[PDB]
Design an enzyme around this catalytic site. Structure first.
Site, PDB file in Angstrom:
ATOM      1  N   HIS A 223       3.438  27.442 -50.565  1.00  0.00           N
ATOM      2  CA  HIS A 223       4.707  27.256 -51.265  1.00  0.00           C
ATOM      3  C   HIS A 223       4.474  26.839 -52.714  1.00  0.00           C
ATOM      4  CE1 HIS A 223       8.552  25.628 -52.477  1.00  0.00           C
ATOM      5  NE2 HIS A 223       9.115  26.137 -51.398  1.00  0.00           N
TER       6      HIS A 223
ATOM      7  N   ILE B  85      13.078  32.006 -46.108  1.00  0.00           N
ATOM      8  CA  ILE B  85      13.391  32.957 -47.173  1.00  0.00           C
ATOM      9  C   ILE B  85      12.154  33.284 -48.015  1.00  0.00           C
ATOM     10  CG2 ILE B  85      14.152  31.257 -48.932  1.00  0.00           C
ATOM     11  CD1 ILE B  85      15.723  34.741 -48.008  1.00  0.00           C
TER      12      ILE B  85
HETATM   13 NI    NI Z   1      11.404  26.250 -50.894  1.00  0.00          NI
END
Ligand code: NI
Ligand code: NI
Lengths: 121, 118
Positions: free
Chosen positions: A9, A74
């Protein structure tokens, strides 16, 4: 001829990148791939395009991209596939193929880890 | 007398909560804790306060909170510790806040499986 690209991430804090760096170091110790690279989706470098370009530059023709994410979200269904050019919105050559893999998920080994953490190990 | 509370980030997509639900179910099969609960930091229920309250209501006096996060970040250093009352800004019950997953050799094992589609 084949590369492992680990993508995470990315955070403002350094811990996310440090995690990917240690994981890549451990993978390299296993002697499974000629080329191992990390990329962070956000906030940090190497970015995901930079990691894939670096793998291609080193001669990889098969780029295995593993999302170091616990669950789908997502970022794994949209943002990362977009950065990889796998879905409509990094130039990938003709002879290069991206192999986009699954996230971690509810693996029995995650249960093992969680129990260790629960007991402070 | 002791509870395991697993906490995850929580997402608009259901996958984050579904993960935590599956992990808790697997933990319950190990028969290690009387009480097992999940809580999501954001977007979903049970929330983290709800999870801890359920554990307390079921009789837990030792509540082991495990952050199901890969790495430390602002949520494990600030947001979750705040929700747990461990930092500024519960009873004779004790909260025991554990460490996240981190670069465990077993994560390397999983990643290698995923790299080969297993
Ligand atoms: Ni995020
Ligand atoms: Ni967040």
């Amino acid at each position: 001829m084949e590369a492992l690209v680990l993508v995470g991430h990315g955070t403002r804090l350094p811990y996310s990148k440090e995690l990917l760096v240690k994981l890549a170091e451990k993978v390299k110790e296993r002697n499974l791939f000629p080329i191992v690279e990390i990329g962070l989706m956000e906030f940090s470098e190497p970015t995901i395009p930079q990691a894939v370009k670096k793998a291609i530059e080193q001669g990889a023709k098969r780029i295995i991209v593993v999302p170091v994410f616990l669950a789908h979200g997502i970022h794994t269904t949209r943002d990362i596939p977009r950065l990889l050019g796998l879905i409509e919105d990094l130039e990938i050559p003709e002879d290069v193929e991206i192999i986009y893999r699954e996230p971690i998920g509810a693996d029995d080994r995650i249960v093992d880890i969680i129990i260790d953490r629960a007991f402070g190990r």
